[PDB]
Amino acid sequence: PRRIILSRLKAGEVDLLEEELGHLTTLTDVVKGADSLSAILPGDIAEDDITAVLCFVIEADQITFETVEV
Amino acid sequence: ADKELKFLVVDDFSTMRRIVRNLLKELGFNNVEEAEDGVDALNKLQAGGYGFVISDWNMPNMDGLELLKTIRADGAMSALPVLMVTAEAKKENIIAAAQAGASGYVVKPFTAATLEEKLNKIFEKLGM
Ligand SMILES: [Mn+2]
Numbered sequence: 001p002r003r004i005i006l007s008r009l010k011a012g013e014v015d016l017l018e019e020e021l022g023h024l025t026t027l028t029d030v031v032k033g034a035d036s037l038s039a040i041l042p043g044d045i046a047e048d049d050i051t052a053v054l055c056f057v058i059e060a061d062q063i064t065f066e067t068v069e070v
Numbered sequence: 071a072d073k074e075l076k077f078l079v080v081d082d083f084s085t086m087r088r089i090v091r092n093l094l095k096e097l098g099f100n101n102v103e104e105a106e107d108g109v110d111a112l113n114k115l116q117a118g119g120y121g122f123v124i125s126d127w128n129m130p131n132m133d134g135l136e137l138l139k140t141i142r143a144d145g146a147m148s149a150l151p152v153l154m155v156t157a158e159a160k161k162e163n164i165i166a167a168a169q170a171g172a173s174g175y176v177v178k179p180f181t182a183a184t185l186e187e188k189l190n191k192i193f194e195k196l197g198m
Contacts, residue, residue: 023159023160023161023164024164045161045165049165049168049169052165052168052169053164053165055168056168056172056174056175056191057191
């Protein structure tokens with residue numbers, strides 16, 4: 001599985017990106033920091049696509065993916 | 071945001087273009103020109119002077135996605151903000167629009183507020 005970590009988000013920018021992610025795939029382990037967001041994503045949309053759409057708001061440097069074992 | 075930014079609102083449904091023209095006027099943008107499809111839009115853009123393009127998705131002759139691609143591939147126009155208007159918030163559309171180089175997307179019908187949010191963010195990412 002994969003995990004997405006968004007950093008340096010503005011106020012409310014976290015919620016916005018959650019719903020944004022809710023259109024491409026389904027998030028599991030949703031953590032909402034005051035300026036961060038992290039969630040687990042299944043093997044759906046390729047990382048580039050997620051990044052392409054998220055860049056409608058944030059910069060690529062704010063997105064990071066990470067693996068996770070079962 | 072220069073309130074004299076020359077917008078080009080592309081849509082094959084006149085009424086949708088009228089609505090958009092109003093929403094913009096409400097937000098203070100009065101320089102709005104219309105086009106009925108990608109081909110019309112491209113012909114009008116040739117004259118230059120525009121600074122933003124709001125474009126609908128499906129249109130005869132040349133659809134929004136193609137208009138985006140063509141704009142992105144053209145020298146003088148490549149750096150022109152294009153806001154894609156889709157009718158459904160389906161991922162395939164949303165992803166294709168991002169891959170193509172759209173400055174954003176908004177699902178219709180949308181309010182003046184929604185429009186204004188989308189516009190503010192696009193202006194933000196370009197410091198304009
Ligand atoms: Mn249409």
